[PDB]
Amino acid sequence: LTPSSKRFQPFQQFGRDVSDFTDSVRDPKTSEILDISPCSFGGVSVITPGTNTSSEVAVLYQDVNCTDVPVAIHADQLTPSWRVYSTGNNVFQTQAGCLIGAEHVDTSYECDIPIGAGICASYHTVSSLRSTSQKSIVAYTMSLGADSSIAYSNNTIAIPTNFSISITTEVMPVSMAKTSVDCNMYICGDSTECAN
């Protein structure tokens, strides 16, 4: 419940939008109009390197700035371990949202876990390597391809003096499992009354 700027007709007690969600209410005691908002603001995504590998995670909040996440997720009502992911030192801002719990490095690698908007995540060793064996979730900009220089000139050509024989492999599905369903068995399988 929050204060609202919604303007109400003199006698209407609540307001609803097209989906019939109750957007606003009027307080009977004070006659002020309050906005009602959903408890969960929007989607959150957990990034994990595999429970096999680690128990570390990163959290991505899709619609929020990094300044607004503790309010957006109601950190004061969460457990302290969630509040650890509400705010911190490892906080990064992406066009996908705010990403918390991943170290941001300026090296660009091939995409491993796609965060979005050009940002990927991985499980590299920490750059500092103080423990020399620690590994952290690392967030970086995806590398599109290898940098190459080709020199355009007039009156100069490049001609191959050699060749290689290459054999590559291409895997193609052509079929799937043929399945049959005896719907009478699936629903009311042994019951005569149900079959009727």
Ligand X SMILES: *[C@@H]1O[C@H](CO)[C@@H](O[C@@H]2O[C@H](CO)[C@@H](O)[C@H](O)[C@H]2NC(C)=O)[C@H](O)[C@H]1NC(C)=O
Ligand Y SMILES: *[C@@H]1O[C@H](CO)[C@@H](O)[C@H](O)[C@H]1NC(C)=O
Residues that bind ligand X (CB under 6 A): 29-30, 65, 68, 149, 151, 154-155, 158
Does position 180 interact with other proteins (CB under 8 A)? The reply is no
Please state the closest distance from residue 114 (CB atom) to ligand X, in A: 22
Q: Which does 84 bind (CB under 5 to 8 A by kind): ligand X, other proteins, ligand Y, none?
A: none
Q: Give least dist CB 22 to other proteins, A.
A: 7
Q: What end-to-end distance do the CA atoms of the chain give, in Å?
A: 53
DSSP 124: P
Q: What's the full length of the chain, in residues? A: 196
Of residues 75 and 111, the one with the C-beta less far from ligand X? 75
142/118 Cα distance (integer angstroms): 6
182 binds other proteins (CB under 8 A): no
Half-sphere exposure of 55 (CA within 13 A, CB side): 0
88 binds, among ligand Y, other proteins, ligand X, none (CB under 5 to 8 A by kind): none
* Partner from ligand Y, ligand X, other proteins, none binding residue 44, C-beta < 5-8 Å depending on class: other proteins
What does the alpha-carbon distance between residue 184 and residue 196 come to, in Å, rounded to a whole number? 11
Residues that bind ligand Y (CB under 6 A): 52-53
Neighbours of 102 (CB within 10 A): 26
Q: Per CB under 8 A, does 47 bind other proteins?
A: yes
Which CB, 15 or 49, lies closer to ligand Y? 49
Do the Cβ atoms of 70 and 58 come closer than 8 Å?
A: no
- Please answer whether residues 61 and 73 qualify as being in contact, where contact means their C-beta atoms are separated by less than 8 angstroms: yes
State how far the Cα of 98 lies from the Cα of 58, in Å rounded to an integer. Answer: 10
- Between 130 and 172, CB nearer to other proteins: 172
Q: Residue 72 CB, nearest distance to ligand X (Å)?
A: 9
